[PDB]
Design an enzyme around this catalytic site. Structure first.
Site, PDB file in Angstrom:
ATOM      1  N   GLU A  75      35.762  52.531  46.772  1.00 19.17           N
ATOM      2  CA  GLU A  75      36.288  53.183  47.970  1.00 19.17           C
ATOM      3  C   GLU A  75      36.559  54.651  47.676  1.00 19.17           C
ATOM      4  O   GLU A  75      37.231  54.977  46.696  1.00 19.17           O
ATOM      5  CB  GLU A  75      37.596  52.539  48.464  1.00 19.17           C
ATOM      6  CG  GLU A  75      37.455  51.148  49.042  1.00 19.17           C
ATOM      7  CD  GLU A  75      38.696  50.685  49.794  1.00 19.17           C
ATOM      8  OE1 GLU A  75      39.595  51.527  50.041  1.00 19.17           O
ATOM      9  OE2 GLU A  75      38.762  49.478  50.136  1.00 19.17           O
ATOM     10  N   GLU A  81      42.655  46.019  45.216  1.00 20.45           N
ATOM     11  CA  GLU A  81      43.897  46.778  45.119  1.00 20.45           C
ATOM     12  C   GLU A  81      45.124  45.882  44.970  1.00 20.45           C
ATOM     13  O   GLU A  81      45.973  45.840  45.869  1.00 20.45           O
ATOM     14  CB  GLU A  81      44.033  47.680  46.350  1.00 20.45           C
ATOM     15  CG  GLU A  81      42.848  48.635  46.542  1.00 20.45           C
ATOM     16  CD  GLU A  81      42.952  49.508  47.791  1.00 20.45           C
ATOM     17  OE1 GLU A  81      43.314  48.979  48.862  1.00 20.45           O
ATOM     18  OE2 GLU A  81      42.648  50.716  47.714  1.00 20.45           O
TER      19      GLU A  81
END
Ligand code: NA
Ligand code: NA
Ligand code: NA
Length: 444
Positions: free
Chosen positions: A351, A163
């Site tokens: 995720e 991320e």
């Protein structure tokens, strides 16, 4: 007739600082998040990851727990401050933990997916400027190369960054995450040095030519909806979409930054870090893309501090994160990648999960039925992606266990396993039992 093939990888995910604990054992020095957690008010209730789930010490029990659930892959991150606790100073004892962690995984039929950088930058690195210092590309490259050399015979699936939107904009523009700066220009430069560092690792990884080993990156992606039909809200949505998604997808997979956002940002900050040779390193061919998906954004025109788009609450059910439950955007993003960016390249959901107010009943059970229905709805969208031709290889639930949720501290519980932090006792939530049955049957 399976909805998920026998080759499909049902997995769970963690990150080093969120679960390990042992924050100063076996030669680990501080990361920017240790430091951030001790700055007044930067983490809710002054929580920190000193102990977390104590997974550093309990890992054999945690791997055994995952075996008993049928887990087929485990995504974890490697703590850079454990490996190089000081600049140019390798720590064999830190590598030894990931060696014995990996060995336990392989003996239990679980495939390791290792995230190289999951936000725990060494403090020594930030003290030299961190991601604002172009030299971090070499420090990160040497770190990645050490992992490939020592672990590459046993870990075959590698993720450079988790991320980068968070490591850049959320850390240097919004300032919610470490190191907590609030300067758009620094955020944009950080985002470039992150992508460049990822490209350095990929170049090193290809030079080593390890057998049957794959590399990729993990991006948190959303789908942006305008609050109305208006031209002003469509423009706000384009800004939010390029802010979150296109600013990283275009350089990685097109070899250029999105030009509308180069123009937009350029009214407010410097964008002089863009050049052709950097973008060629950044857009190197990957073996897979990991997608982190949680929620969508509905935006309207305005400016309340960030950019010229204001997120609103549309009024539907949200998790304890305040994030709208909107499973269909998972399909829309996956399909958008297939159509516009990644084509038939393998995709992973690295995720997906939800935080809810879990309570242990008097009989020892956790009836997290909202998390069960959350995961059911999103696996149905993954199943629909596969039916429509998407190259989905696996699905990593966030998270295996309740852990340290960054600026929220321990106030938010994402696990399919409950963790009583006073005793470190693990307790299977009903969502874990549902996951185990989904893995056994592979139909939803
Ligand atoms: Na920790
Ligand atoms: Na603290
Ligand atoms: Na690629």
């Amino acid at each position: 007739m399976k909805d998920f093939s026998k080759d499909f990888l049902f997995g769970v995910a963690t990150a080093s600082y969120q679960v390990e604990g042992a924050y100063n054992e076996d030669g680990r020095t501080m990361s920017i998040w240790d430091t951030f957690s001790r700055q007044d008010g930067k983490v809710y209730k002054s929580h920190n990851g000193d102990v977390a789930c104590d997974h550093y010490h309990l890992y054999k029990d945690d791997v055994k727990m995952m075996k008993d659930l049928g887990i087929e892959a485990y995504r974890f991150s490697i703590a850079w401050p454990r490996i190089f606790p000081a600049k140019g100073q390798y720590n064999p004892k830190g590598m030894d933990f990931y060696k014995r962690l990996t060995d336990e995984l392989l003996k239990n039929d679980i495939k390791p997916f290792a995230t190289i950088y999951h936000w725990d930058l060494p403090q020594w690195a930030d003290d030299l400027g961190g991601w604002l210092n172009r030299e971090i590309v070499e420090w990160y490259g040497e770190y990645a190369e050490k992992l490939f050399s020592e672990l590459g015979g046993y870990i075959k699936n590698w993720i450079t960054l988790n991320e980068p939107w968070c490591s850049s904009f959320l850390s240097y523009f919004i300032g919610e995450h470490a190191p907590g700066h609030k300067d758009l220009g620094e955020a944009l430069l950080v985002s470039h040095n992150l992508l460049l560092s990822h490209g350095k690792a990929v170049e090193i990884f290809r030079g080593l030519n390890l057998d049957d080993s794959k590399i990729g990156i993990t991006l948190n992606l959303n789908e942006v909806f305008p609050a109305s039909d208006s031209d002003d809200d469509k423009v706000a949505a384009q800004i939010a979409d390029g802010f979150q998604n296109r600013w990283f997808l275009d350089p990685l997979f097109k070899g250029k930054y999105p030009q509308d956002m180069v123009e937009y940002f350029g009214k407010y900050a410097k964008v002089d870090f863009i050049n052709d040779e950097d973008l060629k390193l950044i857009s190197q061919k990957l073996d897979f893309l990991g997608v982190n998906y949680y929620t969508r954004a509905v935006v309207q025109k305005g400016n309340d501090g960030l950019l010229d788009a204001v997120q609103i609450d549309p009024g539907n059910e949200r998790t304890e994160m305040g994030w709208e439950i909107y499973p269909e955007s998972l399909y829309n993003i996956l399909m958008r990648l297939k159509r516009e960016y990644t084509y038939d390249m393998p995709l992973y959901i690295t995720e997906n999960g939800a935080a809810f107010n879990d309570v242990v009943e008097d009989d020892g059970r956790v009836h997290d039925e909202k998390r069960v229905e959350f995961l059911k709805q999103h696996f149905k969208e993954a199943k629909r992606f596969l039916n429509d031709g998407g190259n989905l290889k696996g699905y990593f639930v966030w998270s295996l266990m309740d852990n340290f949720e960054w600026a929220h501290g321990y106030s938010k519980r994402f696990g399919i396993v409950y963790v009583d932090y006073e005793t470190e006792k693990r307790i299977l939530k009903d969502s874990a039992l549902w996951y185990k049955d989904l893995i056994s049957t592979r139909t939803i």
